Design a protein around this ligand. Structure first.
Ligand code: HEC
Ligand code: HEC
Ligand code: HEC
Ligand SMILES: [Fe+2]
Lengths: 106, 106, 106
């Protein structure tokens, strides 16, 4: 999918997690977010389509998704353990990473 | 190692996992696959040798291995928990990613 | 932060882990190492400032941190399970990657 579609997936599933009641919903949502973040890594944001995909900004863009992926990893492990409230708290910490990339490249 | 040898390692250890009896065999094989996937990420596949190193195709190639590595991650955790058949099923799900990359770059 | 600051964080926290007596010391140190390794991925080392940003050497540099991150991952899970000596042995295994990257690019 393209970048905006992956962002919609990330946003949709983050809201599923906030409102979630059971670990299965959270595990499923974080799994879709992991796939969306990996797919987004291969995109070029519109404010960067004017650089080499190897520019330092583009590498900063892709590493931003690696940072997001390690945070999703921590949350998905909590969801796998059934720690539903802790997983929701780890998922809320994602938005710092969301906000930092948006400030630079959105 | 070269890309050919890493692909041999991936394929051979995938077979080892299918025939495995115990979790230590699955854990050992998956750990070798993780190392091979990381090493493969450094390669330029023959289909892309005559394109720019800064091409979006090279980025998509490397992200293909990130996708594989996160699926290897899930299987390896199952093996570390002693869940042999679940780890084996998670490893069989690698083949979707193997083939998706092959359709593009093999 | 710049590359040298990230290296100082990696080096300082590896020493903390070697001297740690409890799992919380190790968990906190590895968590800072993970953040530093991800940040270092954005850098261009002085020895490679003359290379194209997507050159095989720059790719090798960035994948070296991916290798480091998966080893940090294993050590951090062991620390989270309270296996302190095991987590310390896993962190000692990081040095092979530190030394291999320095041999090539420092
Ligand atoms: C960079 C590393 C990013 C991270 C991490 C996240 N987002 Fe993002 N997002 C990014 C860009 C460059 C853009 C602009 C895309 C464009 O074509 O304009 C976006 C966009 C969004 C949007 C709006 C989508 C749209 O249709 O316009 C949303 C709702 C969004 N992003 C949400 C979001 C969430 C919830 C994130 C973390 C969980 C997140 N983004 C991370 C770049 C990056
Ligand atoms: C891209 C991101 C790939 C992923 C994921 C996997 N493979 Fe692959 N493979 C890829 C390429 C570009 C090539 C051609 C290499 C060449 O030099 O020709 C291959 C090749 C193979 C082969 C046969 C080639 C050989 O080793 O001589 C096998 C058996 C193979 N690949 C297996 C394999 C498996 C089992 C994978 C998933 C677990 C897998 N590959 C993923 C690119 C990519
Ligand atoms: C490449 C993939 C590297 C890995 C993995 C590690 N390091 Fe590193 N380190 C790297 C470079 C290119 C440099 C040179 C930076 C420069 O500007 O000269 C370094 C440097 C260091 C230093 C010295 C920092 C300074 O004050 O100049 C230290 C103390 C250091 N690195 C430690 C270190 C440790 C402990 C690592 C593993 C945990 C490690 N590095 C990995 C490249 C890479
Ligand atoms: Fe994990």
């Amino acid at each position: 999918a393209d970048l905006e579609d992956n962002m919609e997936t990330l946003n949709d599933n983050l809201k599923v997690i906030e409102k979630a009641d059971n670990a299965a919903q959270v595990k499923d949502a974080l799994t879709k977010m992991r796939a969306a973040a990996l797919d987004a890594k291969k995109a070029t944001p519109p404010k960067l389509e004017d650089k080499s995909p190897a520019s330092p900004e583009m590498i900063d863009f892709r590493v931003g998704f690696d940072i997001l992926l390690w945070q999703i990893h921590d949350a998905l492990h909590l969801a796998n353990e059934g720690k539903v409230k802790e997983a929701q708290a780890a998922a809320e910490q994602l938005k710092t990473t969301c906000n930092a990339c948006h400030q630079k490249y959105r």
